[PDB]
Design a protein around this ligand. Structure first.
Ligand SMILES: *[C@@H]1O[C@H](CO)[C@@H](O[C@@H]2O[C@H](CO)[C@@H](O[C@@H]3O[C@H](CO[C@H]4O[C@H](CO)[C@@H](O)[C@H](O)[C@@H]4O[C@H]4O[C@H](CO)[C@@H](O)[C@H](O)[C@@H]4O)[C@@H](O)[C@H](O[C@H]4O[C@H](CO)[C@@H](O)[C@H](O)[C@@H]4O)[C@@H]3O)[C@H](O)[C@H]2NC(C)=O)[C@H](O)[C@H]1NC(C)=O
Ligand SMILES: *[C@@H]1O[C@H](CO)[C@@H](O[C@@H]2O[C@H](CO)[C@@H](O[C@@H]3O[C@H](CO[C@H]4O[C@H](CO)[C@@H](O)[C@H](O)[C@@H]4O)[C@@H](O)[C@H](O[C@H]4O[C@H](CO)[C@@H](O)[C@H](O)[C@@H]4O)[C@@H]3O)[C@H](O)[C@H]2NC(C)=O)[C@H](O)[C@H]1NC(C)=O
Ligand SMILES: *[C@@H]1O[C@H](CO[C@@H]2O[C@@H](C)[C@@H](O)[C@@H](O)[C@@H]2O)[C@@H](O[C@@H]2O[C@H](CO)[C@@H](O[C@@H]3O[C@H](CO)[C@@H](O)[C@H](O)[C@@H]3O)[C@H](O)[C@H]2NC(C)=O)[C@H](O)[C@H]1NC(C)=O
Ligand SMILES: C[C@H](CCC(=O)NCCC[N+](C)(C)CCCS(=O)(=O)[O-])[C@H]1CC[C@H]2[C@@H]3[C@H](O)C[C@@H]4C[C@H](O)CC[C@]4(C)[C@H]3C[C@H](O)[C@]12C
Ligand SMILES: C[C@H](CCC(=O)NCCC[N+](C)(C)CCCS(=O)(=O)[O-])[C@H]1CC[C@H]2[C@@H]3[C@H](O)C[C@@H]4C[C@H](O)CC[C@]4(C)[C@H]3C[C@H](O)[C@]12C
Ligand SMILES: C[C@H](CCC(=O)NCCC[N+](C)(C)CCCS(=O)(=O)[O-])[C@H]1CC[C@H]2[C@@H]3[C@H](O)C[C@@H]4C[C@H](O)CC[C@]4(C)[C@H]3C[C@H](O)[C@]12C
Ligand SMILES: C[C@H](CCC(=O)NCCC[N+](C)(C)CCCS(=O)(=O)[O-])[C@H]1CC[C@H]2[C@@H]3[C@H](O)C[C@@H]4C[C@H](O)CC[C@]4(C)[C@H]3C[C@H](O)[C@]12C
Ligand SMILES: *[C@@H]1O[C@H](CO)[C@@H](O[C@@H]2O[C@H](CO)[C@@H](O[C@@H]3O[C@H](CO)[C@@H](O)[C@H](O)[C@@H]3O)[C@H](O)[C@H]2NC(C)=O)[C@H](O)[C@H]1NC(C)=O
Ligand SMILES: *[C@@H]1O[C@H](CO[C@@H]2O[C@@H](C)[C@@H](O)[C@@H](O)[C@@H]2O)[C@@H](O[C@@H]2O[C@H](CO)[C@@H](O)[C@H](O)[C@H]2NC(C)=O)[C@H](O)[C@H]1NC(C)=O
Lengths: 216, 173, 217
């Protein structure tokens, strides 16, 4: 809370569906937090379980506002190797620590069930006559690793445009996520076709899945 | 058929973090010291001949089987010393405690760092929790008191768990 | 500002839910103390108002937890009026094992009050099943963030465990938005089509309620 110091924590993000199937250039990221100005290095080391060598990594050390110090390292990963269950590990070491810090990650397991998506659209409201809200529900899928997004006249909208929630389980052993994309009049007059795409490890045939929508 | 020589540890803990200190002493059944002592590490004869053998800034190399013998044939039951490097270490006064004798558990935090909310577990059950670190002092051993133990605690706000430890207690008809 | 976790013992004080406050019209706040250690004597929990006006009798349970710890919860009945009018309640726990006393307080959330906008929807069948259809209800542009969602069906307030409601999230319109999902069975829509997704907020008029009907076909 105040004086009591907090110790180093490490996290390791998994490749997004998108960065993995569309962009076809997946990368995992190891993020270390709560580090503090040390006189020694802070070795970060990437390794595969198969023993096979690894590409060169990235690395940034941002002194944060709260006196702490962060370290992130992103690593390029073979699209094939990953889907075939490979396993990667991040090993950070700090001079003043007992055991080393490690974290690993690989392709999520289980049965692969494709996504079901349904797009909707709000009716006007006395508050404003030129602003209408969109919503897109994607359910009954698994694993939980999903990449949602939107299209509009062949234009993949800005990620910061929509709000997508975090996966949640259902009484059907599958997950469900919600997306919300506020819209401007100007845009639907430009065209009505609004697409809410979805990228999952399942869905065929291009690992993509979309459902059109529109007002009126 | 005589009394064999015993080895005592001070502090008790026969498992310690690297860089820690410990001392081995050979029996009081040789009080005025009538015979030189001979210490054995994993086998070789140590060059210390005195009644107590020290260990400083204990390196891992220092782990192992220790035995001392006097001028007879029999030699002390061996005493095993393990040197660790983790966040929490569960130390015990003795791994095998004869019925009735006392027992001591201690959740020891690395570099003697503070550990708050220490909980000691006994066979998957929560034995004792305290806001702060604390030693488990079992005055008179028993049968229920056997089983595997281990502790957990927070150090610098994070959570840690000691590798598990087995403790056994005997009986004499 | 951290003289709030005596000996490490933390406490939480929950605020009355919209629902328990407007529908049920019998609101209650709850003080939950955690990480206490077993001892000869029990704690000494004490409720008090900032206005100085007396307080109703409270509840109290002490559940020894699995992890060796010990918990204490105390719920307190609260005058529906007093609360909305900004009153302020405080929970004061005190035990020998403790150095400083532990306190926490709470009152009506502040700021501008903007009513909820709700829109109910409904999924089309899918080759997977022809007798299971999914409902969704979006409630947005409201504030404070304290909201109680629920559903009705033929004058029957469905079981809370039936629907999944998310946590509030902000919007580029200074208001919040929450989503709700309620799977449904064929049998039920043949019984009737009218499905209601009510909402309880401190704003919305005139009964502090707000609903939008829905139905398949
Ligand atoms: C020993 O075991 C103990 C339990 O066996 C354990 O105590 C637990 O400590 C944690 C914190 O250390 C407590 O968390 C707090 O929980 C409060 C409420 O509990 C839940 O129910 C309330 C209603 O009864 C809800 O209002 C809460 O949302 C919460 O419910 C969650 O889960 C349900 C189930 O899926 C879900 O529907 C809800 O949406 C919730 O997710 C909260 O009010 C506290 O909130 C605070 O912290 C959060 C995040 O940290 C903040 O976002 C909030 O703003 C707020 O500051 C907090 O979560 C937990 O209640 C204790 N368990 C018990 C007894 O219920 C103890 O830590 C263990 N000790 C050791 C040393 O091992
Ligand atoms: C009497 O007999 C005992 C046992 O036969 C001997 O003691 C052994 O001594 C070796 C050192 O020579 C000890 O090995 C060391 O263990 C350390 C701790 O291991 C932990 O951490 C690692 C890494 O996270 C985990 O994989 C492991 O599970 C444990 O959690 C390591 O840190 C040491 O590593 C360094 O040295 C080794 C070997 O030199 C290298 O491979 C590494 O790259 C690194 O540089 C090391 O492995 C061993 O544990 C001791 N055994 C026991 C039972 O304690 C005595 O030496 C012997 N007496 C004599 C002197 O003859
Ligand atoms: C295990 O025991 C060792 C050694 O024990 C101590 O030092 C010996 C030389 C004897 O004098 C013993 O009687 C004495 O107990 C501990 O290591 C020692 O640690 C101290 C500090 O804790 C060191 O002192 C420092 O020395 C440096 C340089 O010499 C100075 O700059 C410092 O100002 C300070 O005086 C001491 O040198 C060191 N001993 C050596 C030479 O290795 C060890 O700490 C202990 N383990 C624990 C922590 O329990
Ligand atoms: C604030 C000052 C620097 C200025 C720095 C210098 C050395 C730092 C400590 C040690 O590193 C050990 C340990 C590492 C853990 O990870 C976090 C906790 C702890 C105690 C660290 C805390 C703090 O960070 C220190 C005191
Ligand atoms: C950054 C702060 C001062 C501000 C200073 C105060 C004491 C310093 C430590 C000790 O000296 C031991 C050790 C010596 C090695 O050489 C390098 C590593 C280490 C852990 C040192 C690190 C760092 O330097 C310290 C925390
Ligand atoms: C990791 C390195 C040694 C290598 C050692 C060298 C000096 C050590 C610090 C001082 O001892 C002061 C203080 C005592 C508290 O008790 C715990 C915190 C603190 C900051 C200690 C932390 C850590 O332990 C240190 C940095
Ligand atoms: C924490 C202890 C005092 C014990 C204490 O106050 N005990 C009761 C209250 C709360 N706890 C700490 C138990 C909560 C743990 C949370 S837990 O979630 O783990 O339960 C105090 C005593 C002296 C303090 C150090 C020195 O000043 C030097 C230096 C100043 C920097 O500016 C910050 C770093 C550093 C090393 C300081 C750290 C820590 O500050 C110390 C060890
Ligand atoms: C000092 O400030 C930094 C930066 O605000 C704090 O770091 C933040 O730490 C949290 C966890 O405590 C990180 O959250 C985690 O992010 C990962 C990455 O997506 C996610 O997978 C986890 O589920 C979780 O959300 C947070 O990202 C991180 N901030 C940064 C740099 O992105 C730090 O904790 C602060 N120090 C103190 C006082 O704790
Ligand atoms: C640490 O102790 C466990 C548990 O020991 C058991 O309970 C004791 C009270 C005593 O009755 C023992 O004889 C019991 O075995 C040991 O667990 C065993 O581990 C071995 C692997 O070496 C495995 O084959 C057994 O199935 C395990 N027994 C059970 C039922 O858990 C463990 O071996 C001990 N540590 C060691 C020396 O490895």
């Amino acid at each position: 809370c105040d004086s009591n110091p907090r110790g180093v924590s490490a996290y390791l993000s998994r490749p997004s569906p998108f960065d993995l199937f569309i962009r076809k250039s997946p990368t995992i990221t190891c993020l270390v937090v709560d580090l503090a100005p040390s006189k020694g290095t802070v070795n970060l080391t990437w390794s595969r379980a198969s023993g096979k060598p690894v590409n060169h990594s990235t690395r940034k050390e941002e002194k944060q506002r709260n006196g702490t110090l962060t370290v992130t390292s992103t690593l390029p990963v073979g699209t094939r190797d990953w889907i075939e269950g490979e396993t990667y590990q991040c090993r950070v070491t700090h001079p003043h620590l007992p055991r080393a810090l490690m974290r690993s990650t690989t392709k999520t397991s289980g049965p692969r069930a494709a996504p079901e998506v349904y797009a909707f659209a709000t009716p006007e409201w006395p508050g404003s006559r030129d602003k209408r809200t969109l919503a897109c529900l994607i359910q009954n899928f698994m694993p939980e690793d999903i990449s949602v997004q939107w299209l509009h006249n062949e234009v993949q909208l800005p990620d910061a445009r929509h709000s997508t929630t975090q996966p949640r389980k259902t009484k059907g052993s599958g997950f469900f996520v919600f997306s919300r994309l506020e819209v401007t009049r100007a845009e639907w007059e430009q065209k009505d076709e609004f697409i809410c795409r979805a990228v999952h490890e399942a869905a065929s045939p291009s690992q993509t899945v979309q459902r059109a929508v529109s007002v009126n | 058929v005589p009394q064999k020589p015993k080895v005592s540890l001070n502090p008790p803990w026969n498992r310690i973090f690297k860089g820690e200190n410990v001392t081995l002493t050979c029996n009081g059944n040789n009080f005025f010291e009538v015979s030189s002592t001979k210490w054995f590490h994993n086998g070789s004869l140590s060059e210390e001949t005195n009644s107590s053998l020290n260990i400083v800034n204990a390196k891992f190399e220092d782990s192992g089987e220790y035995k001392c013998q006097h001028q007879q044939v029999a030699e002390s039951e061996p005493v095993y010393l393990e040197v660790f490097s983790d966040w929490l270490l569960l130390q015990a006064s003795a791994e095998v405690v004869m019925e009735g004798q006392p027992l001591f558990l201690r959740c020891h935090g690395w570099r003697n760092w503070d550990v708050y909310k220490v909980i000691y577990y006994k066979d998957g059950e929560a034995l004792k929790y305290w806001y702060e670190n604390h030693a488990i002092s079992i005055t008179n051993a028993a049968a229920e008191d056997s089983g595997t133990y281990y502790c957990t605690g927070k150090v610098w706000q994070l959570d840690y768990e000691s590798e598990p430890l087995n403790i056994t207690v005997i009986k004499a008809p």
